[PDB]
Amino acid sequence: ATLKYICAECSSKLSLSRTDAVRCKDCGHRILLKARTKRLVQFEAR
């Protein structure tokens, strides 16, 4: 139910905000992606 971020390696949903640094629970690997949009995108099929 709802997510905000993700880890490059240990692909695990996070969810944060200012103050709590930008790392992850377990492995540091301080990267993190930003998981898709909720409002699905549509495509021409040509």
Add this chain to the structure above:
Amino acid sequence: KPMVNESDGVTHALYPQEARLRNLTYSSGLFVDVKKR
């Protein structure tokens, strides 16, 4: 061997892939045995 000495953190063993993303420099330590006399 290559490593990231970031503050508010220890010292991660840096791998290219990360330096690329994080804009870091895949470099390492230069140590020399000085003599005090």
Add this chain to the structure above:
Amino acid sequence: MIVPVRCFSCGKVVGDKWESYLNLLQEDELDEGTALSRLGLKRYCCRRMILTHVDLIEKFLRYNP
């Protein structure tokens, strides 16, 4: 980089023939030139289509998240 659904030049689907083709190869041990022919790929347009594809995706998959 996945098998081309349908051949650029003429139109014949070719989306399926991949696995078949890759099979009449390592198993039934035939030579490409023929395997294709077996798969119904007459004219060279559809023919070069399969014979040249580099299925990179297989490497792409070997990655991770």
